[PDB]
Amino acid sequence: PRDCPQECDCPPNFPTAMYCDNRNLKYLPFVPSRMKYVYFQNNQITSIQEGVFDNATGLLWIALHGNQITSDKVGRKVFSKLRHLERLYLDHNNLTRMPGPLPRSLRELHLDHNQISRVPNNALEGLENLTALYLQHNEIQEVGSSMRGLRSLILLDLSYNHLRKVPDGLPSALEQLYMEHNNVYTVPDSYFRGAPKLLYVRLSHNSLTNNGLASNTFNSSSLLELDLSYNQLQKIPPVNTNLENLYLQGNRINEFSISSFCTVVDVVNFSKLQVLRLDGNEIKRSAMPADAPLCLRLASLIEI
Ligand SMILES: *[C@@H]1O[C@H](CO[C@@H]2O[C@@H](C)[C@@H](O)[C@@H](O)[C@@H]2O)[C@@H](O[C@@H]2O[C@H](CO)[C@@H](O[C@@H]3O[C@H](CO)[C@@H](O)[C@H](O)[C@@H]3O)[C@H](O)[C@H]2NC(C)=O)[C@H](O)[C@H]1NC(C)=O
Ligand SMILES: *[C@@H]1O[C@H](CO[C@@H]2O[C@@H](C)[C@@H](O)[C@@H](O)[C@@H]2O)[C@@H](O[C@@H]2O[C@H](CO)[C@@H](O[C@@H]3O[C@H](CO)[C@@H](O)[C@H](O)[C@@H]3O)[C@H](O)[C@H]2NC(C)=O)[C@H](O)[C@H]1NC(C)=O
Ligand SMILES: *[C@@H]1O[C@H](CO[C@@H]2O[C@@H](C)[C@@H](O)[C@@H](O)[C@@H]2O)[C@@H](O[C@@H]2O[C@H](CO)[C@@H](O[C@@H]3O[C@H](CO)[C@@H](O)[C@H](O)[C@@H]3O)[C@H](O)[C@H]2NC(C)=O)[C@H](O)[C@H]1NC(C)=O
Ligand SMILES: *[C@@H]1O[C@H](CO[C@@H]2O[C@@H](C)[C@@H](O)[C@@H](O)[C@@H]2O)[C@@H](O[C@@H]2O[C@H](CO)[C@@H](O[C@@H]3O[C@H](CO)[C@@H](O)[C@H](O)[C@@H]3O)[C@H](O)[C@H]2NC(C)=O)[C@H](O)[C@H]1NC(C)=O
Ligand SMILES: [Cl-]
Ligand code: NI
């Protein structure tokens, strides 16, 4: 049992892999039953025909990035019988909608550099082993509640999109969240309290104003780095003493309030901030009081 499409290469030393990448292919051949790894990247494929993977029920990897696939030419239920699929690469195509339904066994999903306009609420239903989701460089306007059920998700990249609203609910294991270069103008009260293990957040180049925030929005005990540069902030939003890096350059901040870092300062209460950028705002260095180091006791680099 070693049949192989003529346009592809199947190594004898590794009979469960099939290489069809970078060959000017125009369509997908039907995959042999034994295959676990298939590589179709960097061709001129335009469609994923119905039933293409139905013989290979043991597929783990599918690489389809770097083609010209459109959403109307993704076959019906084409991924449905692949109940062990772990990794799927669909970045750099011509997709306008989320493909699906997707197998509940997925661990990584790449969908960046397409033209996806929206993530419906049920688009990622049941993917409880998904650890990384790449969606940057699309035209997404909203994702709704699609992220709530992803119990294993560590990384979510939504940067360089058209987001008007932050995701309505975050999963509990999330550590990295990137949403820079979007159109966010509001963030709700206690938004990050639902993500106990969140470490890195980027929200630069959006349309944030203090009136669109709550007092405690960015006060979270888990955060290490927070990037909010080039918004339209007039005041330093309050933060937790655990925060280590804060970027606020290119805003409209017109006062230095020490109470944004520490509500009370004593021998054991103080900010652990190491890096702080406040340059490109409406304050001079003299706006920072002489006794500021009592609060910012660890600040090694402060730019104003
Ligand atoms: C996709 O899969 C089909 C069917 O797979 C068959 O059913 C599965 C449940 C497994 O048990 C497979 O092992 C099994 O093959 C493949 O078609 C099948 O091809 C084989 C040839 O290797 C056919 O067997 C032969 O059939 C002739 C005619 O009856 C006999 O004279 C021979 O003695 C021998 O038995 C088998 O009949 C055929 N099955 C069907 C339903 O047509 C198909 O090749 C495969 N495609 C790829 C690309 O892998
Ligand atoms: C899949 O998408 C590619 C790329 O689409 C490009 O990026 C998008 C974000 C939009 O901005 C699109 O407007 C943009 O094209 C498509 O490739 C594109 O094909 C068209 C023709 O089909 C190309 O236009 C030509 O451009 C040359 C100059 O190089 C002119 O001389 C021609 O007269 C003609 O106008 C376009 O340049 C090309 N873009 C890229 C980046 O290669 C692709 O067609 C599409 N595939 C499907 C199946 O929809
Ligand atoms: C979500 O993922 C879990 C667990 O995945 C596991 O953990 C990873 C870190 C890796 O180590 C993976 O290799 C590993 O599978 C899935 O649960 C697992 O399901 C498989 C069935 O496909 C179970 O296989 C069994 O394993 C036992 C040995 O304990 C054998 O005796 C059996 O014959 C059978 O092969 C596996 O045990 C099970 N693991 C756990 C920890 O539950 C889960 O299926 C997956 N979710 C979805 C929807 O696919
Ligand atoms: C950032 O957030 C911390 C902690 O926030 C606490 O936990 C959240 C989940 C919410 O439930 C908050 O409501 C809650 O306060 C803030 O630290 C907290 O500051 C308050 C002062 O407003 C402390 O409360 C006071 O404590 C004294 C002495 O115990 C009492 O006498 C007072 O009556 C009053 O209750 C609170 O103890 C303190 N918590 C911790 C864990 O340190 C922090 O102020 C905030 N930062 C900014 C800039 O707003
Ligand atoms: Cl980039
Ligand atoms: Ni880019």
Numbering used by the authors: 73 to 376
Article, verbatim:
We obtained crystals of a natively glycosylated human fibromodulin construct in which ten N-terminal tyrosines were mutated to serine to abolish sulphation (N-terminally truncated fibromodulin was not well expressed). The fibromodulin crystal structure at 2.21 Å resolution is complete except for the disordered N-terminal region. The N-terminal cap (LRRNT, 79-106) contains two conserved disulphide bonds (Cys76-Cys82, Cys80-Cys92) and seals the hydrophobic core of the LRR region. The LRRNT of fibromodulin is followed by eleven LRRs (II-XII) that contain the consensus sequence LxxLxLxxNxL. The ear spans from the first conserved C-terminal cysteine (Cys334, disulphide bonded to Cys367) to the β-strand of LRR XII.
The SLRPs belong to the large superfamily of leucine-rich repeat (LRR) proteins, which includes not only secreted proteins but also a large number of cell surface receptors, such as the Toll-like receptors involved in innate immunity, the platelet von Willebrand factor receptor, glycoprotein Ib, and proteins involved in neural development. Here, we report the crystal structure of fibromodulin and a different crystal form of chondroadherin, which reveal that these SLRPs do not self-associate in the same manner as decorin or biglycan. The results demonstrate that, unlike decorin, neither fibromodulin nor chondroadherin forms a stable dimer in solution.
